[PDB]
Design a protein around this ligand. Structure first.
Ligand SMILES: [Zn+2]
Lengths: 141, 177, 49, 117, 76
RNA sequence: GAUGGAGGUAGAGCACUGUUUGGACUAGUUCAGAUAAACUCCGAAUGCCAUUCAUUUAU
RNA sequence: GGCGGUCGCCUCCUAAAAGGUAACGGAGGCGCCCAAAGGUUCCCUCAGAAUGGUUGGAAAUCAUUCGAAGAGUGUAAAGGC
RNA sequence: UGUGGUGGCGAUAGCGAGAAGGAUACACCUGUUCCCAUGCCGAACACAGAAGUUAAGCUUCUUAGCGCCGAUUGUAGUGAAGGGUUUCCCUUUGUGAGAGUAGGACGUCGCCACGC
């Protein structure tokens, strides 16, 4: 599980995703991408589950870029406790993802291994996805 | 006094030719001489800056400044403004007399004649000597001394490239290796 | 240690002013030249013993 | 080492003198320049941005001494010349110097021959 | 069981007269902390940075060089 | 409706402070990519304050 | 309801770009101190880094060169300088 | 015209690299007797000067590497008016950025003095 070292604030607000990605919508470092087409929260455990599945399938390695980091914490109260007093205790970490964001990148491996690995990563996740390659600019090798 | 003649009569023609100076303003000089004492022991015994100052003033006709803390570090039991060391600055004739007594009387009292290192030029043309004790001078005495301590020296000049000062400094004395 | 105080005139004896001081810092009595309104003049005022 | 020029160090003090001193046409601004061999003086109003009178150290005809005595003559000259233009109520800008030496000489000579400060 | 729960009274800071409004002597123009805005022709500063008119005239918010603002009052 | 103005939100940005991924490097700085409620080099729509102003209206 | 906490005052976020705005919402301070740490007149410019230097070490104190602020501002934070 | 001084205007006025120049003026430079000064030092500030020099400041001129001033049209947002599940999304009408760019830019306006 990824965790931020040293937060400045222990609790915070949650909202208000209102989808459209602000940042990385193109492949930057690899050859193949996994782009989210819905907007949702994505947690520590979902990322690690997807990463383990993606790497296990690629015997002889290759490389993998995780491009999504959980910055924002949770809180929650307990069963049997009435409404009222201040926020609960923090339990978890998440990152909000909006539609358009590329989330993983793979390279050093032909199509079918990369496509199978990105297929296995998506069943571990709560979003709809596409698979994209680097298309066309002044230079794309 | 002793070296203004020496400048305008041996050295300025030399240095003006060796680097082909179109003007004589271009020829470097000696601006300052600054002496330092790092006592660091008024921490313990208040009567240490006193001896440092007595010795430094035995050297030159000038009561030295007093340098204080400038911050507070607990490694050395330092608050702010704890008077630590003394310093002196030398202009004009106080500089030429002091350079002469450095080259011609005092320095060679030091043995194991390593003179002056040459990794000692700042990279911009000023030089800093080094002294371990006080007994190297004819202004000091035998018995009065009680500690092995010596003084730092810095000689500042008006030179761009180190070697210009190397020559302008050896030419007046300072017996380098 | 800090205590309110009154300064009293030294010619007409009128307590004209109220002020402060720290009495472990200033152990003795304050002394100021202040305008005295009864005489319309600047006079040496002193703190009440 | 790098010795700085003095003229910039005194521009840095002159800009702080001028946050208070300023000159209108009722109360023009008596300025001063002091160089290595002279001292000058102008009488300046600022809403219009112009000079009303002037006098210079060794430009026109002052001499009869070359100690601080050159300054008092300039003070007397601007006093007479500005009284010629109906001027009595100036304000004194030191430049960035001290009110002490040969600027005090010019100022004093101004105060004897017609200009109320 | 919380240890928060306290605040101070709001202070009603801001602009108290508009650009282009005529104003009588002594009327407040702007309440602030520190000089966000500066005093200009015929305007004073108080002890806690409030800006006030000295003379009757119209109010004009202007620009002070590159990055500062000014208030002036101009009589007819 | 027209004209002037005060102010930092919705964007989006990484100059400042937190949080953060790759690569080159070395002392023994750099090239890229993200992020924020108590971050800001920037910055709307609308609302608000005015005016010897205009057109309708009756407060 | 009880038990627990809270009860006046200051600064920030919430607060939807004027002002105002709830909650047993999220974070901190106050119940003083200074005879100069107040007034006024002159003068001054910071924190670091790199290079050399005896004790002296990473780091006390000296010298030079870069350095718009990365310091300081009696005390919390914001706005200022 | 050239140079000294003193002013307005958002650095389009700045920074760095490069050249040249002493006619007067500006400077560096030379000294401490006398007014004044160093928490040590005539370094500075203060004064007396006029041997020396354009090396440094200063002035003029070249340079778009760093800063600065930047449109247009496209997007993101959002006044009004409507529609699906209402977490969110869409269609008309009006407004319209921040980025990213084409371009600008090595100042411009004025008073005084002296010299040509
Ligand atoms: Zn009385």
């Amino acid at each position: 599980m990824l965790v931020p070292k040293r937060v400045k604030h222990r609790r915070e607000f949650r909202g208000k995703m209102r989808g459209e990605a602000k940042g990385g919508k193109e492949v930057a470092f690899g050859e193949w991408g996994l782009q989210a087409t819905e907007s949702h929260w994505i947690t520590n455990r979902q990322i690690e589950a997807a990463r383990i599945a993606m790497t296990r399938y690629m015997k002889r390695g290759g490389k993998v870029w995780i491009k999504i980091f959980p910055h924002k914490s949770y809180t929650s109260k307990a069963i049997g406790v009435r409404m009222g007093k201040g926020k609960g205790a923090p339990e978890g970490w998440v990152s909000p993802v909006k539609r358009g964001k590329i989330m993983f990148e793979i390279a050093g491996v032909p199509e079918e291994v990369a496509r199978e690995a990105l297929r296995l990563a998506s069943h571990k996740l709560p979003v709809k996805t596409k698979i994209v390659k680097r298309e066309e600019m002044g230079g794309e090798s | 006094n002793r070296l203004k003649e020496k400048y305008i009569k041996e050295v300025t023609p030399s240095l003006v030719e060796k680097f082909n100076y179109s003007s004589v303003m271009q020829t470097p000089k000696v601006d300052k001489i600054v002496i330092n004492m790092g006592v660091g022991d008024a921490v313990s015994n208040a009567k240490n800056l006193d001896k440092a100052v007595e010795e430094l003033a035995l050297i030159t006709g000038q009561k030295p400044l007093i340098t204080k803390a400038k911050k507070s570090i607990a490694g050395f039991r330092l608050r702010e403004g704890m008077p630590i060391g003394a310093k002196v600055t030398l202009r004009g004739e106080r500089m030429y007399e002091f350079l002469d007594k450095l080259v011609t009387v005092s320095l060679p009292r030091v043995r194991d004649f390593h003179g002056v290192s040459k990794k000692a030029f700042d990279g911009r043309g000023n030089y800093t000597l080094g002294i371990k004790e006080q007994l190297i001078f004819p202004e000091v005495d035998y018995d009065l001394v009680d500690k092995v301590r010596g003084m730092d020296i810095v000689i500042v000049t008006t030179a761009n490239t180190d070697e210009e000062s190397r020559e302008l400094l050896a030419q007046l004395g300072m017996p380098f290796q | 240690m800090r205590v309110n105080i009154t300064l009293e005139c030294t010619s007409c004896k009128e307590r004209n002013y109220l002020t402060n001081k720290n009495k472990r810092n200033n152990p003795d009595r304050l002394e100021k030249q202040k305008y005295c309104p009864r005489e319309r003049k600047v006079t040496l005022h002193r703190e009440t013993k | 080492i790098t010795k700085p020029d003095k003229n910039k160090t005194r521009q840095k003090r002159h800009r702080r003198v001028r946050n208070k001193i300023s000159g209108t046409a009722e109360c023009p601004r008596l300025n001063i320049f002091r160089s290595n061999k002279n001292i000058y003086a102008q009488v300046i109003d600022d809403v219009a941005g112009v000079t009303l009178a002037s006098a210079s150290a060794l430009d026109k005809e002052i001499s009869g001494g070359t100690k601080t005595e050159t300054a008092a003559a300039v003070g007397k000259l601007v006093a007479e010349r500005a009284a010629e233009k109906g001027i009595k109520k100036v304000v004194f800008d030191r430049g960035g110097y001290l009110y002490h030496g040969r600027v005090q000489a010019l100022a004093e000579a101004a105060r004897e021959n017609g200009l109320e400060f | 069981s919380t240890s928060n729960g306290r605040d101070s009274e709001s202070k009603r800071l801001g602009a108290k007269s508009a650009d282009g409004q005529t104003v009588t002597g002594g009327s407040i123009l702007y309440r602030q902390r520190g000089t966000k805005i500066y005093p200009g022709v015929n305007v004073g500063i108080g002890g806690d940075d409030t800006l006030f008119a000295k003379v009757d005239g119209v109010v004009r918010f202007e620009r002070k060089g590159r990055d500062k603002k000014q208030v002036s009052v101009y009589p007819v």
